[PDB]
Structure formats: C-alpha cells, structure tokens
Amino acid sequence: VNSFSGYLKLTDNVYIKNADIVEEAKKVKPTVVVNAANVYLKHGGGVAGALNKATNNAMQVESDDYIATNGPLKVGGSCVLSGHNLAKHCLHVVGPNVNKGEDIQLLKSAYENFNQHEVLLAPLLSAGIFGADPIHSLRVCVDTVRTNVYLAVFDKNLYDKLVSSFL
C-alpha cells in the first residue's frame, strides 16, 4: 500500500491521473519523482521548468554542479539527484526531443531507467515540448517499465484521450 490517490489503473504496474506533477509531488513526497530532463540539465520549461521553479531554483544549482563535474547526460540516460522539497530523489531522465531530430527509438532506453526504482511518480517521457506522440509514449511506458509507475498528465483533454484510446 502506498499514498498515491485517485489514479486509474492501466496495468499490473502502471497507473495514471490528470494532475500537475508539481502539486502531486508536494502532496505525496514520493521516494522518486522523474524529471523530463535534457542532456545539459537546463530546466527551462515544460515539466523541468515547473519542477525547478517549485524548488526555488535549487534543482538548477545542483544540476549545474553535476554537469560541471560529469558532463552532459546521454539521450536515453539518467542521473539521480536530490528531490529537494518535492521528493526524496529526482530521477532526471532524458527522452528524445523530436524537435531536435533525436531517434524516437531512444524512448524505450529512457523508460528503462525507471526499472532501477521500485516506485516512481513520473510524466510521460518525450511528451509536451519534447514533441513525441503521448499515446506512443504511454505505450512504450507500459511495455518497458516493470516497476510501479504513477503517471501525472497535466492536460485534462490529453488525459481523457490517453485513457479512452488505451489498449
């Protein structure tokens, strides 16, 4: 039993809700919140900009030190950093950005990072400003993640479409 509330169950291990991931993290304080990161950990907009804003820019300060030490992530890769006031940990995961020409096949590799964590609160990778089809992202999530994932979808119209079209 966990504290996630109001989710629709899609499969044995995947759950979904129309919710602002920032507000959801603040309420649940999950062990892991997933950020929709880029390779530079520049949290300017989309989910990343919103999560970082909620940390009062502490996420960005920590991220800049991480990059200065380690260099950029790989597309499809991840790193674990602090969750600040939102969660114990933040798993920064880089899905391919279609608006940069990146290989959509890398979306499966991106979701594989979730399997290193027993339970996660997450957005749909490569959705939103990353330009991928969210219906496809949900399909890859369900077919790749084996651990327990609670998906927050900000847009109500999109949430209803994802549920209604789910096979």
Ligand SMILES: CNC(=O)C[C@@H](C)Nc1ncnc2[nH]c3cc(Br)ccc3c12
């Ligand atoms: C239409 N874009 C998506 O669907 C992409 C998806 C990854 N974005 C989000 N997903 C879940 N919760 C979220 N809260 C937010 C608050 C702010 Br401001 C900006 C974005 C999000 C956000």
